[PDB]
Amino acid sequence: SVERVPVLIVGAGYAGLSAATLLAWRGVPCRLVERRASTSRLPKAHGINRRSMEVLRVVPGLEDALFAASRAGANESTLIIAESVTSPPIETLVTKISLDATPVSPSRICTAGQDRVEPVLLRFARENGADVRFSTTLERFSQRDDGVDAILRDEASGQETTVLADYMIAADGAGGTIRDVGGVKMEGPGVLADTISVLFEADLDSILPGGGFALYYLRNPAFSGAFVTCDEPNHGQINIEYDSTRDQASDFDEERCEALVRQSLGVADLAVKILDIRPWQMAALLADRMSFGRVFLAGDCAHITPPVGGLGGQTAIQDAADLAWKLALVVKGQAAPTLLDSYEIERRPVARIAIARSIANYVERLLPDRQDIRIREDEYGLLETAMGYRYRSDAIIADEFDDGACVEDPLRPSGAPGTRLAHVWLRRGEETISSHDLIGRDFMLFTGPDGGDWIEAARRIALRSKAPLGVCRLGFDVDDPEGLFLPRLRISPEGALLVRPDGYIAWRSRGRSPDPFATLEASFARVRGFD
Amino acid sequence: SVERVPVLIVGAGYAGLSAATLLAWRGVPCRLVERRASTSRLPKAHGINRRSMEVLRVVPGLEDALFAASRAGANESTLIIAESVTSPPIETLVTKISLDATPVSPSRICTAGQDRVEPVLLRFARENGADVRFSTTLERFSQRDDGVDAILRDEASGQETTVLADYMIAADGAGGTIRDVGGVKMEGPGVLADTISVLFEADLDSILPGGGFALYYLRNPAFSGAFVTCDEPNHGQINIEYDSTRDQASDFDEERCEALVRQSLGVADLAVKILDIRPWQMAALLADRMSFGRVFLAGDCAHITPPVGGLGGQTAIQDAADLAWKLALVVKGQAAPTLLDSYEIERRPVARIAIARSIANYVERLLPDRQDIRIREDEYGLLETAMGYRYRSDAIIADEFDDGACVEDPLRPSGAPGTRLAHVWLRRGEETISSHDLIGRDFMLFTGPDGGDWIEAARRIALRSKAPLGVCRLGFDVDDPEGLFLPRLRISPEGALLVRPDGYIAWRSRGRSPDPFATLEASFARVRGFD
Amino acid sequence: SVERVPVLIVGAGYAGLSAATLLAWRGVPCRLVERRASTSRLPKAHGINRRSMEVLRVVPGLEDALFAASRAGANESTLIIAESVTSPPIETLVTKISLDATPVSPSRICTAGQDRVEPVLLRFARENGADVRFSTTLERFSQRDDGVDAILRDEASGQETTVLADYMIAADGAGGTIRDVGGVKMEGPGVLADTISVLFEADLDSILPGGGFALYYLRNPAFSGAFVTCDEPNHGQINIEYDSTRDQASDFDEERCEALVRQSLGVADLAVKILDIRPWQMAALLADRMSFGRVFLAGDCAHITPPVGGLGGQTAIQDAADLAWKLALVVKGQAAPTLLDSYEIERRPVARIAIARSIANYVERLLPDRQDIRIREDEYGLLETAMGYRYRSDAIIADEFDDGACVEDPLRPSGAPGTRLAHVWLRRGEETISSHDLIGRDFMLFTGPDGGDWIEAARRIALRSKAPLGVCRLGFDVDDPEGLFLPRLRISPEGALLVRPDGYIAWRSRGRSPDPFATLEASFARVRGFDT
Ligand SMILES: Cc1cc2nc3c(=O)[nH]c(=O)nc-3n(C[C@H](O)[C@H](O)[C@H](O)COP(=O)(O)OP(=O)(O)OC[C@H]3O[C@@H](n4cnc5c(N)ncnc54)[C@H](O)[C@@H]3O)c2cc1C
Ligand SMILES: Cc1cc2nc3c(=O)[nH]c(=O)nc-3n(C[C@H](O)[C@H](O)[C@H](O)COP(=O)(O)OP(=O)(O)OC[C@H]3O[C@@H](n4cnc5c(N)ncnc54)[C@H](O)[C@@H]3O)c2cc1C
Ligand SMILES: Cc1cc2nc3c(=O)[nH]c(=O)nc-3n(C[C@H](O)[C@H](O)[C@H](O)COP(=O)(O)OP(=O)(O)OC[C@H]3O[C@@H](n4cnc5c(N)ncnc54)[C@H](O)[C@@H]3O)c2cc1C
Ligand SMILES: [Br-]
Ligand SMILES: [Br-]
Ligand SMILES: [Br-]
Ligand SMILES: [Br-]
Ligand SMILES: [Br-]
Ligand SMILES: [Br-]
Ligand SMILES: [Br-]
Ligand SMILES: [Br-]
Ligand SMILES: [Br-]
Ligand SMILES: [Br-]
Ligand SMILES: [Br-]
Ligand SMILES: [Br-]
Ligand SMILES: [Br-]
Ligand code: NA
């Protein structure tokens, strides 16, 4: 049996499920295959940061559903370093007060665990048309010049079928083997720590009186680890590091783990139900390339990060967001296949900074002595890393005076191409909407109120079906009373600003042009891979 | 037989009197000459911010005195934008509740005017041994090999005199011609507005509710300007911009200024007695050099900033305090004269951002239509600009992988070298002091409780070194009960932290060193100009 | 004794000042004479194209100075066809977006006009040792077997002077008479148009939007011409074609040119200050020969091109560069005089297509009505003409199966001997450089990573060959991560590539050689004019 599909996604985690929901929503028929039988697995990741939600909230209903699926609710997150969760805090890294005082995004922080997120993505992936098939395995594949030939295998029978796809998203995890087909090599420090993860049930309401969602980095003299509060109330997980020379994963039975749950919580005796025990590793590795022919590595198969910064799942989501909009343009013929060359160019350095940020969080919060393992070249600030990372590819018309910075303070936007369009409230009559509520579907061209020569130029381009472009004239379609949009992005009232479907600035004009149509038509062509 | 002096100061505004007050307190005999007969002139500036009060409070008694000389007192400051001082607010920028909600400093805001501040500074300069000669003018000068040959002149007789100085601080104001001797070119936007300042007396208690300090930025349809309250009660000041192509300075006689006072106040029946009228310019200019030879430019002669934000007089004070401690070391043989090369490389960027900040306050507050004059690359937060600027020079051992950040949030301190040592309520036994109460006089070495290797290295250093070095070990000399000092500065219990006499961090070690003496000795030598 | 100088250059335009700058930078003492008293003239040309900037950039500081002297800054060029400079464009041929999206060269487009470009060249010629004497004329000359003896004449006085010179670069412009001493015939269409050129001053700021360089081809119903922005702010220049039978050059007084400046600008009520009015012509003529004896014709004196392509000032520069590296070898005794026979062999066909390209642009852009003047036999693409021209001569060891093509697409390089070395971004350690940053001074030998046999041959050659030979290995000295250089030029890792001082490939071996010393020696010798 042989069927064809535009996009084939292998893997039903954060990367693959996001890729399918966004590719579905943007009108691209896809099929997702996943070896497991359901999303039902132990939670690993907790929380969706602001940028992850920005790329996901273009899908109607998705954001509220993610927040409804959470126990703690919006911005209700605390981060503490201590010797145990009942010990005096060594330091307090984040609170609801601190998240509320950083209005850098139309979205707040969502705290939901992976065990709650993956079903909601599956839900919206299917509602918008994705073909998600569980208990189905990519057995093997090869690439002809016009598509991928994939062999699929039913886990219940072993019966095989062939699917032909224009493109395939390898989303197959840290241990994923699709990349080996392409000879990609994971480079980096490698495995830095052996860990053992324990899921337990216990009276957590009393120990943690006023925290909705809590994460404690436990830095004590017996061991190092962390404790997280799960979405199921009175459920929690600890991830304790162990030395593979002094102990072994087999050595952690129910009796021993109940003591670890009590040591890490700072309680002498507490009734602890051990629900599951898992040995894991903490590694730092980056792929040398993130795509080969028509195969695209997304998520943990492209970049393994130390799970200390909580950046792994978010890079996976944003990886899958970058693929979704770009692939949706290529299969519709609104972009050249060359646009897909920009994927590892833009997304790989982002992964290099996450790995470095994550290593730095691990030293600073858990093992401050181990400064040798850090990559201080690539370290940047926490919000800059999650949210101010910059892109530089042929998918972007750089500013003439580009300083080459890897990040930009989201608090001090310059409006340079390659940066994430700033969040600013605007006015659409008596209602107020974020600038981000005006982007995310097609490209968008913002012009100042004197930007009518650009508007007409954009409307001649947007006449074409090949051309996915809309226009917004400031002071006509929406008003910026405070001057915090186009003035702060250094756009004069005769200027124009082009933003991608992922919300990143692609091109700007401080002011007027001798021929606005030719300027814009050439900008628009170039950034979609045409010449 | 010619009079000889270590430092000669020219001019007795904020810059010059600050320089003399601090130079004298630091044991340096100095002479300040000033053309005018006394301090008594009508005041332009109002207020001393928290950073300026921080460099001034190292002088015993000086901080209380300044607060005592003000009509309104600590944090009693209100900033409003409207169409007249009795029109409904258009915005509100600053309140006593806003400034009480920011415990960034050992000091609060002092609202005293120029006409109040300068006599107090004169008081303490002379008290600390400064030689302040009014009615005396620097007529001309020439730098020799071994000093500056100055020709002083008496305004009463025309009699002239020679003094030889090791160094000369040029504090001669926005128009000062000392800089023209050095080829100093002032660069920037230049004159931005023509203004007229009216000092008046009216029943201000009737139409102003609070009894504290009030500043109204005025956006009339007829004119833009500002109203301020003066320290003499029922005295106020309006600084109104005017178009030089439509009206000229001479056109503003008592009658017209009486009309302007009533317009800008909103009461068209109020009796107004015009005490002075003054034309003035609003300008933006920066010097290419802030030193040449043994001459140093401090205050308005080095940087003319628009007077919206009140940064011009605060920079002057802080220029002066930078000179006072570096000069004090160099004339004491305790630093190499190379240290003075750090004056303009540390101070000129601080003035660069203040010029950009004041332009931005001006546009945002008074002329939102003039977005084009802004210098947006150099604009930072209001509290970053006044207080979180950073210093990069050879007077500062920069921590490697420096990101080049021009400011740092005072609220989120990192302890990196070239930043202002954070304010933290420590405990000296039962006394509760500020971290700032332990700095200011000599170089200070803080260390963590396990940092005794540094301490003894420090003590052996100071035996030889010409410059003192104070030490203070945490948990011993002072106590940090809530880990908000050395921990938050990312200094381990075995680390150390070298703070300059101006309170800025010169060098840090996160932990131990294999030869702590050799690293401290090298550091301490390098941060005083030796190589 | 007589004043003796290695190369005498006559004329200080693009050709002559480029020859002087490059000769002096290559170590050749030379004398340039120019009849005029300073470089100060009216701006004619605008722009230095990418290829011209490659041959000029070898001289340290020169490229930065040319961009520094220009009002508009790199790639900030708009070409537009319209009825007036305020009419809606008929077609826009070029934008900065279009120019930035063509990474064919290390250099970008400099927009500086002739009045800016000529002082920069004179400055760099002199910094490098060139002897430039204004208010000096070549009065007459003759050739010997050992040089040209020249009579120089002072314009202030008419005092005359003899100088004997190994070689004489004839760079004396379209009107130049040096070629007539050689009996050089100019051949081709001849004069195609009479034109008048008006230099004016007007508030162009409040008319032109963008603040960069702009050239407008005017398809006005009343007339055909062109407006150009000048480097001096609020200065422009119009080149208006007039019918010599209906009007004559003397009929364009200040009142009429002010009218022209308003029509071709489209602004009815505009203040025009006429600064100069000049009648000119627009011709297409190619020289019989481009050298005779020790005299080499460089610049417009060897090829007059219609000024629509904008290739005449560019061909002059590249003429000069070709002569400069070749004379520099011959006068240093590092190359046989034979090498100079290749000058006109290689440069004349390049002028032939520049003329054909320029005629084709004048017709397409301004007068589409009469294609009868086109030389379609020699028309090629714009970038192919400017940049992808090919050299065939006894100075390039032609590979087997020569196609015969006059041009090659610079975007699809093949590595054939006789083509320009492709611009490839390479890595030297941490820094990223161009392949071109590695060429320009001496002959360069590129080998693959497994080409030590060539490098060893080359280092022993260089040890006693009169000319220097540099070597660079693609595994060691610089890195080519994306295999875009030697793989794409069809060179295996045991191959080598020989590149001339002008950057054109002279010889290639795709694999190993049975005697790598023998083949490299005979190749290095032949490409320098030595026989067998
Ligand atoms: C202890 C821990 C805590 C973490 N905490 C956080 C956190 O707080 N925040 C955060 O953002 N991130 C966190 N992370 C990281 C985050 O969980 C992962 O980065 C993220 O889930 C990776 O998603 P993915 O889609 O790349 O891969 P995966 O979740 O690995 O999914 C890949 C899927 O591929 C399937 N598959 C593989 N091969 C095939 C095949 N041939 N056919 C079919 N299916 C196949 C597998 O069955 C699997 O479901 C944490 C990680 C750990 C270990
Ligand atoms: C309307 C207005 C409002 C302002 N408001 C504020 C505010 O709220 N807050 C604030 O911080 N700043 C404010 N400023 C700015 C502030 O007043 C100045 O920046 C500050 O006074 C500069 O001090 P200075 O010592 O550099 O110079 P000046 O005050 O100009 O003093 C220099 C002195 O040098 C003397 N002098 C010059 N040449 C000689 C010579 N040859 N011999 C002897 N003496 C000489 C002069 O007589 C003069 O007194 C305001 C300015 C204006 C115009
Ligand atoms: C309207 C117009 C626009 C143009 N636009 C462009 C353009 O955009 N781009 C471009 O590349 N080209 C352009 N050109 C062409 C460009 O101007 C020429 O190709 C170039 O300037 C020729 O340089 P040259 O050195 O050959 O000659 P010339 O500029 O003619 O210099 C020759 C010199 O020789 C001197 N001379 C002559 N006889 C003697 C003697 N006996 N002794 C001493 N000195 C002597 C002359 O005084 C003269 O200065 C344009 C031309 C025109 C007319
Ligand atoms: Br975030
Ligand atoms: Br299913
Ligand atoms: Br709970
Ligand atoms: Br992670
Ligand atoms: Br706007
Ligand atoms: Br299109
Ligand atoms: Br002291
Ligand atoms: Br402050
Ligand atoms: Br003076
Ligand atoms: Br000020
Ligand atoms: Br401590
Ligand atoms: Br070109
Ligand atoms: Br031309
Ligand atoms: Na469209």
XYZ file of N, CA, C and O in Angstrom, chain C residues 473-513:
164
model
N 47.851 26.414 -0.209
C 47.265 25.073 -0.179
C 45.916 25.079 0.517
O 45.781 25.612 1.628
N 44.936 24.429 -0.122
C 43.558 24.456 0.355
C 43.285 23.549 1.549
O 42.139 23.483 2.005
N 44.268 22.848 2.073
C 43.950 22.204 3.322
C 44.505 22.974 4.493
O 43.998 22.896 5.616
N 45.558 23.739 4.226
C 46.439 24.216 5.281
C 46.390 25.729 5.431
O 46.058 26.222 6.513
N 46.704 26.483 4.379
C 46.805 27.935 4.518
C 45.438 28.573 4.684
O 45.262 29.465 5.520
N 44.461 28.148 3.882
C 43.078 28.579 4.027
C 42.165 27.379 3.837
O 42.511 26.395 3.181
N 40.968 27.495 4.395
C 39.986 26.427 4.412
C 38.772 26.808 3.564
O 38.339 27.968 3.552
N 38.236 25.814 2.847
C 37.091 25.946 1.946
C 36.015 24.977 2.422
O 35.818 23.904 1.825
N 35.283 25.330 3.485
C 34.388 24.342 4.113
C 33.298 23.851 3.191
O 33.054 22.641 3.110
N 32.640 24.758 2.484
C 31.548 24.411 1.588
C 32.022 24.055 0.182
O 31.273 24.277 -0.778
N 33.243 23.533 0.034
C 33.752 23.020 -1.232
C 33.399 23.803 -2.486
O 33.161 23.214 -3.549
N 33.367 25.139 -2.368
C 32.903 26.032 -3.425
C 34.017 26.597 -4.286
O 33.725 27.252 -5.286
N 35.274 26.368 -3.927
C 36.388 26.917 -4.681
C 36.941 25.832 -5.595
O 36.401 25.600 -6.680
N 37.984 25.139 -5.137
C 38.662 24.141 -5.966
C 37.764 23.014 -6.486
O 37.974 22.574 -7.631
N 36.802 22.478 -5.722
C 35.866 21.522 -6.329
C 35.066 22.115 -7.475
O 34.901 21.474 -8.524
N 34.571 23.340 -7.304
C 33.692 23.924 -8.309
C 34.468 24.399 -9.535
O 33.907 24.455 -10.635
N 35.750 24.727 -9.377
C 36.624 25.030 -10.500
C 37.221 23.768 -11.124
O 38.185 23.867 -11.895
N 36.672 22.586 -10.776
C 37.028 21.280 -11.353
C 38.480 20.908 -11.080
O 39.178 20.381 -11.952
N 38.940 21.156 -9.856
C 40.300 20.813 -9.454
C 40.226 19.775 -8.344
O 39.657 20.040 -7.275
N 40.809 18.594 -8.598
C 40.859 17.505 -7.631
C 41.818 17.873 -6.510
O 42.552 18.853 -6.610
N 41.845 17.106 -5.417
C 42.771 17.442 -4.328
C 44.229 17.241 -4.682
O 45.090 17.657 -3.899
N 44.550 16.619 -5.817
C 45.931 16.518 -6.269
C 46.215 17.452 -7.439
O 47.209 17.272 -8.156
N 45.349 18.446 -7.644
C 45.483 19.420 -8.701
C 46.047 20.766 -8.247
O 46.252 21.051 -7.065
N 46.309 21.606 -9.248
C 46.816 22.945 -9.011
C 46.276 23.896 -10.069
O 45.884 23.490 -11.170
N 46.285 25.181 -9.710
C 45.684 26.258 -10.484
C 46.633 27.446 -10.435
O 47.026 27.871 -9.345
N 47.018 27.968 -11.602
C 47.935 29.110 -11.701
C 47.182 30.383 -12.092
O 46.624 30.469 -13.190
N 47.216 31.382 -11.212
C 46.456 32.619 -11.362
C 47.426 33.793 -11.520
O 48.407 33.903 -10.772
N 47.137 34.668 -12.494
C 47.982 35.801 -12.877
C 47.821 36.953 -11.893
O 46.926 36.938 -11.047
N 48.684 37.979 -11.981
C 48.486 39.191 -11.150
C 47.143 39.904 -11.357
O 46.661 40.560 -10.421
N 46.527 39.808 -12.543
C 45.201 40.375 -12.767
C 44.076 39.460 -12.317
O 42.910 39.828 -12.472
N 44.389 38.279 -11.787
C 43.375 37.408 -11.249
C 42.749 36.447 -12.227
O 41.935 35.625 -11.809
N 43.094 36.517 -13.508
C 42.632 35.529 -14.478
C 43.471 34.258 -14.376
O 44.680 34.323 -14.141
N 42.806 33.100 -14.516
C 43.474 31.798 -14.472
C 44.332 31.634 -15.717
O 43.855 31.821 -16.844
N 45.597 31.260 -15.528
C 46.517 31.083 -16.646
C 46.720 29.631 -17.081
O 47.087 29.408 -18.241
N 46.493 28.652 -16.193
C 46.840 27.245 -16.373
C 46.201 26.432 -15.250
O 46.133 26.904 -14.110
N 45.734 25.216 -15.566
C 45.237 24.310 -14.529
C 45.594 22.864 -14.849
O 45.670 22.464 -16.012
N 45.823 22.086 -13.797
C 45.951 20.639 -13.899
C 44.985 20.033 -12.899
O 45.125 20.258 -11.694
N 43.989 19.292 -13.387
C 42.957 18.826 -12.463
C 43.466 17.705 -11.568
O 42.954 17.536 -10.466
N 44.477 16.959 -11.995
C 45.010 15.912 -11.158
C 46.505 16.028 -10.998
O 47.067 17.110 -11.203
N 47.168 14.936 -10.637
C 48.609 14.947 -10.499
C 49.275 15.003 -11.871
O 48.652 14.773 -12.913
N 50.575 15.292 -11.856
C 51.380 15.239 -13.062
C 52.497 14.218 -12.893
O 53.041 14.067 -11.791
